[PDB]
């Protein structure tokens, strides 16, 4: 605990300089998420305050690309939900509570400009999907169907590439990998049902072959998702 507190203090001191904070922001994209997880797990007021200060310094306006860094943190590490949970929780330390409130306000301001499309784009870039609300939201798919087909179906091509990578990674058949594969299959089925022009692009890019390969997967959920995608493709 003492070593972790000293490391957090050193990180905050380094991040006090905007140039060093900006350099460390790109050094580890998951550093903010790890710090938030450590702050949530740790019950020490001093450690939580140091973690909050370090997180704020990275997203502080002094550091370069403050808005971009804040948006990336909120999209990847779920900074807004963690900050909202921390605000609801009661902290004995007044300085830690003030830092948590400031971080929550910053996260809310960053998320106000952001939308579900930005979150979906970030998830696609990170190649991580765990059945997000947008995937199961019919309205989100209806209002984002044109966006997916935009730029010569760039989003559809990215989804097809992610599905192909998951199929290549299907040998491991990890639970997270299986969930990602199922989410990608559901997204492909939605993009085929709505604006079926992407179906031809997926077939050209081997999406149908990937779905057929996933139809023989050992996992029951993956097999069911692949069967549903095949039914949406040409099935009744």
């Amino acid at each position: 605990i003492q070593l972790q507190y000293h490391s957090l203090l050193l990180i905050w001191l380094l991040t006090f300089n905007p140039v060093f904070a900006n350099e460390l922001v790109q050094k580890y994209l998951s550093d903010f998420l790890d710090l938030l997880k450590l702050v949530k797990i740790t019950i020490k007021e001093k450690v939580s305050r140091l973690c909050i200060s370090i997180i704020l310094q990275c997203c502080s306006t002094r550091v370069k690309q403050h808005k971009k860094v804040i948006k990336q943190l909120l999209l990847l590490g779920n900074a807004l939900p963690t900050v909202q949970s921390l605000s609801e929780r009661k902290y004995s330390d007044e300085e830690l509570r003030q830092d948590i409130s400031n971080l929550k306000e910053i996260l809310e301001n960053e998320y106000q400009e952001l939308t579900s499309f930005d979150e979906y784009v970030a998830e696609l870039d990170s190649k991580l999907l765990c059945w997000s609300p947008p995937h199961v939201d019919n309205g989100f798919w209806s209002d984002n169907i044109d966006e997916f087909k935009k730029d010569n179906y760039k989003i559809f091509r990215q989804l097809i590439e992610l599905l192909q990578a998951k199929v290549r990674n299907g040998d491991v058949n990890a639970k997270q990998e299986k969930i990602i594969i199922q989410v990608a299959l559901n997204d492909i089925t939605h993009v085929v049902e709505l604006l079926p022009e992407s179906i031809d692009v997926l077939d050209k890019t081997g999406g149908k072959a990937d779905i057929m390969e996933l139809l023989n997967h050992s996992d029951s959920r993956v097999k069911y998702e692949a069967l549903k995608a095949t039914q949406a493709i040409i099935g009744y």
Binding site: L227, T230, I234, G235, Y236
Partner: protein
């Protein structure tokens, strides 16, 4: 699989049905084009 084969066979039957429909529609269009050709001949006349 078997389900895909039935769907593909249905598509094949639909395509075969569309082939007869396309031929019938094209034959009607050919007759219609001949009537339009008569109008073109009238314009030439």
């Amino acid at each position: 699989d078997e389900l895909n084969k039935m769907q593909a066979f249905i598509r094949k039957e639909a395509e075969e049905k569309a082939k007869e429909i396309q031929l019938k529609a094209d034959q009607e269009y050919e007759i219609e084009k001949t009537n339009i050709v008569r109008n073109e001949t009238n314009n030439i006349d």
